[PDB]
Amino acid sequence: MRILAIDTATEACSVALWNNGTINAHFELCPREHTQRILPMVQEILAASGASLNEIDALAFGRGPGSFTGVRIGIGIAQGLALGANLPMIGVSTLATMAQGAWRKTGATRVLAAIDARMGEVYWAEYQRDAQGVWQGEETEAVLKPERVGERLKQLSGEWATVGTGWSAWPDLAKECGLTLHDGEVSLPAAEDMLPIASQKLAAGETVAVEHAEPVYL
């Protein structure tokens, strides 16, 4: 089947289409104005793989956390796209997406995701890929102050890969914790990494109707 993923949760916007494993994706840093770029990206990606919106089985959307406005804009477009085509929707975490990206690029299986939320906050998550490739640790997603993150890091063990803008925003985090951290090579989520996660949810039937697609509230 086919899965179309869309992400506009952060400073970047991206689209990806999954077709029996074969991926078609596009990623670009999105200005303070995302909306104007999604639709064209979507139509390009669909055309590239010779697919119609009505031929897609599910539409994966970025449920955040991240930009309050950006996350909601993306969900809005996604719903529009899914409603007009009667498509089931799949919410995917921005933090989990970056973790999958770390696995894709560096083979990391334990990811500490930290997003530099404005005004001194950070969106945090501790993700660990299990044997079936499902990222465990969604219950750890939270919005914390740098200080509490530093506190959290002292309770962790084993090695981890770091992903997200939060690390460069608060360089003391990786420095003061006694953990062995590796660079996940992921600063921002990419729709292409949303696909593997959306597919596993589809396989389990964890989808939502258009009217129930919403942003995560941490």
Next chain:
Amino acid sequence: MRILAIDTATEACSVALWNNGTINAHFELCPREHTQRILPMVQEILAASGASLNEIDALAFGRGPGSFTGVRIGIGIAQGLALGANLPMIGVSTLATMAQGAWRKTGATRVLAAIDARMGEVYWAEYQRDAQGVWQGEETEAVLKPERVGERLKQLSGEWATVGTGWSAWPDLAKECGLTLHDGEVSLPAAEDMLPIASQKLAAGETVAVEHAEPVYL
């Protein structure tokens, strides 16, 4: 046939559905966050008239002028909705929409539309309904300084109905011009008034594909 109109160009957001003349509409003042309200409004309206998105013949969208961000958000959702359903799109002017509203509520046939654009500017238009009900004067749409509007008013004649927030923002306009002005009873556009205009365009085949739907640039 059926026409679905959506407007989020100004401080208000609205949706309306035309079914062989029978209208179903909803209007509400939209906060600094519109996106979150459109989809539900759309699904409500479609359900109320027992219609599916795929049963609609055209999707009318607010092409502005108005909020730079608001206008683009609306177009984005509309495109999403139209693409997933393979629907032809119809751009409708925010100023013309308010003029149609004035005709609906007061029978006005000559409308001076003025929108209070931020930072001391005003979106302006001189609209006149012809015998077939088509609003002539689209070529007059422009972004002007209050002073130039006052200047423009001195070149006009006959009576006019006033619509838009621009009049209350610059009360000297109606006071210093020698024109007989009547209250159009319309401060903000309503999707329901976009319908008659979208229908005439549909009848003439003046529609655009999803990828060509864009905001007006004054």
